[PDB]
Design an enzyme around this catalytic site. Sequence first.
Site, PDB file in Angstrom:
ATOM      1  N   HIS A   1      34.712  48.573  46.511  1.00  0.00           N
ATOM      2  CA  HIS A   1      34.871  49.334  45.291  1.00  0.00           C
ATOM      3  C   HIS A   1      33.913  48.750  44.268  1.00  0.00           C
ATOM      4  CE1 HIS A   1      38.071  46.579  43.122  1.00  0.00           C
ATOM      5  NE2 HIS A   1      37.791  45.965  44.270  1.00  0.00           N
TER       6      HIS A   1
ATOM      7  N   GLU B   1      34.385  42.064  47.076  1.00  0.00           N
ATOM      8  CA  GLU B   1      34.490  43.054  46.020  1.00  0.00           C
ATOM      9  C   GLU B   1      33.030  43.300  45.604  1.00  0.00           C
ATOM     10  OE1 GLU B   1      36.063  41.973  41.878  1.00  0.00           O
ATOM     11  OE2 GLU B   1      37.261  43.789  42.211  1.00  0.00           O
TER      12      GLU B   1
ATOM     13  N   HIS C   1      40.649  51.103  46.887  1.00  0.00           N
ATOM     14  CA  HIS C   1      41.872  51.444  46.149  1.00  0.00           C
ATOM     15  C   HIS C   1      42.141  52.944  46.172  1.00  0.00           C
ATOM     16  CE1 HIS C   1      40.786  47.348  44.303  1.00  0.00           C
ATOM     17  NE2 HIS C   1      41.324  47.250  45.524  1.00  0.00           N
TER      18      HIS C   1
ATOM     19  N   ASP D   1      37.218  54.425  45.415  1.00  0.00           N
ATOM     20  CA  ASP D   1      37.557  54.033  44.038  1.00  0.00           C
ATOM     21  C   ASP D   1      36.993  55.180  43.170  1.00  0.00           C
ATOM     22  OD1 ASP D   1      38.765  51.022  43.982  1.00  0.00           O
ATOM     23  OD2 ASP D   1      37.959  51.118  42.069  1.00  0.00           O
TER      24      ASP D   1
END
EC number: 3.5.1.28
Length: 187
Positions: free
Chosen positions: A34, A116, A154, A164
């Site tokens: 994301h 991430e 997510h 995302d």
Amino acid sequence: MLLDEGWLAEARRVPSPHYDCRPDDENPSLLVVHNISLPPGEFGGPWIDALFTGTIDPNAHPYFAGIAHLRVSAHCLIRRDGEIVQYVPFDKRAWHAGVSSYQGRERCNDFSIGIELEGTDTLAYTDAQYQQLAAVTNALITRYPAIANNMTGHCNIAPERKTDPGPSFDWARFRALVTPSSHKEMT
Ligand SMILES: [Zn+2]
């Protein structure tokens, strides 16, 4: 991948100033894809630094302003210029998502030693990210094998066409480069 002093090599060390602790236990091996920006590793945007110093104002939206009160901690943050930053090694669990689920496994919190990615308003991501990430991911799979078939974010809680509020990480490119449900051993 190279490893130096049991830390991740060819990365910038930015150990978060206050880690987390969450009351959950599932084996840490999930790759989180994301585009976020939360910690002030290197930038000139005062909003990100305002979070860490604590002067953040509840202007952007409720989630960010809300969570500010709780400290944050990611694991490995790859910035949009093909850079690798490390916040929080494999020692003393982090938190950077809220909630995510994949293959009938929901993680109550981001309680896994993933990755991430970081960018700012979809500023040129530098394909190099995908190549270097795949290398790190090869090592991480060889450390804990799950990630090889466990890539989510997510918004990727079910539809892989969204990951995302801003995916565009070319799922075909990445999945081809990373372990393609082949070129693996054991399980
Ligand atoms: Zn996210």
